Design an enzyme around this catalytic site. Structure first.
Site, mmCIF file in Angstrom:
data_model
loop_
_atom_site.group_PDB
_atom_site.id
_atom_site.type_symbol
_atom_site.label_atom_id
_atom_site.label_comp_id
_atom_site.label_asym_id
_atom_site.label_seq_id
_atom_site.Cartn_x
_atom_site.Cartn_y
_atom_site.Cartn_z
ATOM 1 N N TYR A 157 13.357 -44.097 -37.646
ATOM 2 C CA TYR A 157 13.426 -42.667 -37.931
ATOM 3 C C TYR A 157 12.287 -42.207 -38.874
ATOM 4 C CZ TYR A 157 15.415 -38.136 -39.404
ATOM 5 O OH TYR A 157 15.602 -36.798 -39.669
ATOM 6 N N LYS A 208 24.986 -37.669 -36.141
ATOM 7 C CA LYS A 208 24.884 -37.993 -34.727
ATOM 8 C C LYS A 208 26.278 -38.331 -34.170
ATOM 9 C CE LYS A 208 20.750 -37.195 -36.314
ATOM 10 N NZ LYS A 208 19.885 -38.388 -36.466
#
Lengths: 397, 397, 397, 397
Positions: free
Chosen positions: B112, B209
């Site tokens: 990420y 998420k």
């Protein structure tokens, strides 16, 4: 018209907020979303490299949270605001954005304990050293400055006994030495003090206290120049602490702050009545409240704050045992560690939140065995006084 | 009976949660409070020096948030959980709790982007250096270790092209050298992968998420040994990042995770169908999806994950222009930067979220001009395929 | 100690609320549940035939909503409270609980329009007839009573022009004839008027206005004898309207009402200043505000209300066109149909909410072409006056 | 493209919802407002006489609640939806909108108890009589019709023992006699049954159960022709019940319904496994579950529903005492009155919710002493079966 032109109560109610453009909804919608969609790849490109300078929203610039940040920027007379997950995160996001390994900070000593712990233990482990000083003596601040000094950090009024710090004077000292001044304005709030107008560069709050005021949000806010806030947002929050405020917490704080003016007026009127009662009571040795004429820095408080706040500290005759008895005999005041709520909250630090810290270290830290801290709420002040009178009398007969 | 004894779907629904003791309320109450009151000074004393080892609640151990932390501890088979304001705050709170000036970290490269920025820019400014390696090659991890190395940090599957990291092997390497292994399990979630069961010491998620799954919470969670979590709570969160999760966000994530099993099953069944369609399509040069037999680490994924996840990346013929056309021609998929939502979300990194980063740096970072990332939602997979087929056809005719 | 013994501001803050017993959470938890679980079949048996007379909770007696109902029971000096989905549902749940086919109601004419529509159209279709009277003339009420008359229904102050109704006198009339008196106390709220203390049997509010006060809840409350409220709950709500309040709406109204005292004081101080300004303005023909000495029922208002409220109505010179110009020229006041918010809201009924209703029917209904209704908020009163002065001047030059 | 063209799972996720136009927020914003502001007096005039036929929003047509109403209109294939405070309010708002003094209703007998109470006691007190019939026998419905009959009201599957009602046949009967058919679709939900597609004019749900599915909202929804829904909104809700749904409850139900498809599939797969286990168990005399081949109306269920639902009823050997023992010996199933939650919920009506109702009246009402009703949740079905096996064995040894 411009939010910045209205009177302060008008700003409290309106600043940063408008009816929703698409619907006319009067309340700011809760944008409880994690994601924002783009209308095309171009929009995706522009307004995700652009970094929120049209009106494009992002999870670091949520529409709800934006409203709260703009409100508080207006109330503090700063350029920009940045909300955060907690008052501690407002302070650490700020300092960790400004400071790197090899930097130095001069900090007030008489500050919130968790701030003191971040500064004394955490910062030096990242190569950032801190000197603690008595900020009631601006000369101690000057004397602690070093070539490495990036920022001077103060709280006022100071945490336990509500001694004051002369912001204007300290700002001048810090700027002459090329440091920023960061002021924690939690205990005063916008309404009672405006550090930026006195020369501070950055103000931080725990909104957990007065700005929200309802005892149901943990949150923080940072206000300062756009240039600083942009870094605190796109680097400090995004990269370092991740201390984003949830849009729901922002919405509740927006709703809480609508009543800031009238709550501060009520807290302050109540606290003054209560402080005067305590000042007249033969079982109370000392009363610390900026609103009393016997406050050593009474003149400074007059210049620097518009009201003397809703917090009172005081010492009960008979030390530790009297403190625990009084606290156990209150019936309306609630025993708690927070402050700035609608309810009156009371605590005995030496009896509760400081039991490990031997007699030497707590008294040194301004905490005497008989010290009680009172957050005055919105109840009838005669009910609060009756409750105190009843508990004191029990504790000291 | 004990939460830890039930089957996994049963744990998803029940772990960490019970009907409210005082009321029988089936839903976990939202304890949206900032303050907790004490019944006496003794209680104040004990259970604020004790540090939450009876059942006493505090704003770092909110009853609602406690339930979520315990749930995720159970799902990950860790001792204790700690919620946070964001997935970034889960990662920084962890690392800043473990690491001090002079420490070193070995990290995967294919992670990420905001994690990469915290590690590459922020950490070294606090005296903590980081070596980035290709974690698909456990030998590169071993070769980067130093006497200063405190922790190895990996994501799997890896962020852009869903290459995998052999957790068990890397854990062995890290432990032999006396480092901790921290795994970001965001993209798999409890349901598809359990790093702690493979030798990781600490797992972090963005609950933003899949764990929440509803596109309406930003949040993070950390799971590991009590001893570590106690430090991450009472030092990392309390002192360093202040990245507390709001009780409302915890409540929503608790509610989102109730459906984790059936959402993961649906996302994974849908993604497999979609991946197979894309694998058969002459305008798609490459499809990256662990569930396809052509995945280079197909065998590892078989050993290490129970399902192949709901994320697909793929390359469209015709590079940058084809990518922007496809993205602009979708009618059901939504253009967004997040993933793990109920809706299908699509993005073209080279067209959107990476427009500044010249041709050299993005391709290097695994991002090709024609790369599209697809978060597969809960729609009918034939609707998603029809939407993709329509957009691809437009983009490549 | 007992909530009912404290001063009124203390009751506003504390009544119906305590720290959560299991956790010490200071804020009332949001019990956002639809279901409550039992510990055994015995408990299921007892406390679901018992009908909530131990402490057992049910969706009609949610813990959060219970707190709000008890608070408002205390503030109104009634035995019991019952929250509802809307102010209309508080009124219809009440009346439909009391009245059956063949019953009669005597009602004030000068009441909320939707109430007037329920009474004029809906009630007679269920066999319940209603006579409308000018309740400013208690003799018209007496003269309308019939052997079938079950209840007299009044609002005060009356909706458009804030004429008053003598509650004590009307209660005596209704009781002598064996009817109940139901008073809609929305516009005064607990703080400014207490109908039950004057002989009313039941009070209803839209909490949508002052009791919540934040412009973000639609809700209603009913207060009266336990015996009545039990029927309104277990029959009216459960069986007839189903107008249950959601626990979140109850929580927000609980939070809104914490500031009731200081908001009412601010609204009333502001409205008085504004009313005096309007009374002195040569473009305003009439000002309707109970706080002005020129109010025809000034003496009654003195006896019956503790403050004169935050609503003002007034007539602008030049009728319809002047009204529309003024309304279109305000810059701070917001055009809206609600009242009792923190923001100042303005409306021109003849220009907006009554455009179909020909010139005959609206004027008859107390609405003149030049009538403006102003809900005074918490802004600085000089900002509101400046805004009004600016708009009036534009509208009448 | 048009919501109505997608597959059903796609509609579940997308119908009625779009990214917010002004912000791109993916989650529907919570418009938690009571008031909507106008931009001028003209707008006030038009779009408050117009009655919401442009896009103008009002508290009866809140943007959040609008999204939920449109979603459910799409899922049910009706023109328009209307949310309400409760499932009871959906039913009473509907019926009280349609029916006046002198009207008649034919209703199924085997219906939700509170519906039965509204119909048997409340309706006749407003001059509206009701005939109750066994709707499993469409001939009893025809035979009860009268010239006054406005509507036929049915639930299916029927409440206790999940016998079915032939909607298509009953719709034909009602329409031939000029009555409307109202179907309560709560227990099936959109996913398993679509009454409007079978000839029903109006469908009502308690969203409290499956549509929300999370055990944390009480709410109702009505779907039908625009012409009817307009009346149910602007007269039934506005004037009669006031049973408005709060925007937050609508938001949560929107979020709950995102998973409707996969929850219904899981509930139904689980219930089938459990029903088969119970059918094979020598201590269970009878199992009522449409999914079993021994269901008397197995053929009808095949034609009329796409899945056999998540509710099972069954009779334990040994009557009342066995029922109470079983219920007291379950360790995972929770004792509760609701259904349609993520958790498995169990109840013994004759042991709990019907203790007053003597042996004659309960058995008559389809409730036998040994009848248990099971709402099957999302746990592992082997955990639920193990829990049942353990409790049954204890109760019947």
């Amino acid at each position: 018209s411009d939010c910045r032109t209205y009177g302060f109560n008008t700003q409290i109610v309106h600043a940063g907020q408008q009816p929703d453009p698409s619907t006319g909804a009067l309340s700011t919608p809760i944008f409880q979303t994690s994601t924002f969609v783009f209308d095309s790849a171009e929009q995706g490109a522009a307004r995700f490299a652009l970094e929120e300078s049209g009106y494009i929203y992002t999870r670091l610039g949520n529409p709800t949270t934006d409203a709260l940040e703009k409100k508080l920027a207006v109330l503090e007379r700063g350029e920009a605001g940045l909300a955060t997950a907690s008052g501690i995160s407002a302070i650490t996001t700020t300092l960790l954005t400004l400071c790197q390994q090899g930097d130095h900070i001069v900090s007030a000593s008489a500050i919130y304990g968790c701030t003191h712990a971040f500064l004394s233990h955490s910062m030096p482990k990242f190569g950032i050293n801190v000197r603690f000083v008595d900020a009631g003596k601006p000369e101690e601040i000057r004397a602690a400055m070093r070539p490495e000094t990036k920022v001077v950090y103060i709280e006022t009024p100071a945490n336990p006994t509500l001694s004051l710090v002369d912001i204007e004077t300290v700002a001048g000292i810090a700027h002459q030495q090329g440091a920023l001044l960061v002021v924690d304005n939690t205990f005063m709030s916008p309404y009672c003090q405006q550090p930026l107008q006195l020369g501070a560069d950055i103000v931080v709050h725990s909104v957990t206290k007065y700005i929200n005021g309802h005892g149901d949000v943990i949150g923080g806010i940072i206000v300062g120049k756009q240039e600083f806030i942009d870094q605190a947002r796109f680097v400090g929050l995004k990269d370092i602490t991740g201390g984003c405020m949830s849009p729901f917490n922002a919405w509740l704080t927006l709703r809480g702050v609508k009543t800031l003016g009238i709550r501060m007026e009520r807290h302050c009127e109540n606290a003054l009545k209560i402080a005067r009662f305590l000042e007249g009571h033969p079982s109370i040795t000392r009363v610390y409240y900026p609103g009393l004429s016997s406050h050593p820095q009474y003149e400074l408080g007059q210049r620097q704050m518009s009201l003397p706040g809703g917090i009172i500290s005081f010492e009960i005759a008979g030390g530790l045992e009297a403190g625990r008895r009084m606290i156990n005999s209150v019936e309306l005041c609630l025993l708690a560690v927070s402050l700035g709520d609608t309810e009156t909250l009371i605590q005995h630090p030496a009896s509760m939140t400081h039991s490990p810290v031997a007699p030497e270290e707590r008294l040194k830290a301004g905490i005497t065995d008989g010290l009680i801290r009172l957050s005055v709420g919105l109840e009838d002040p005669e009910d609060i006084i009756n409750d105190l009178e009843h508990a004191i009398r029990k504790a000291t007969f």
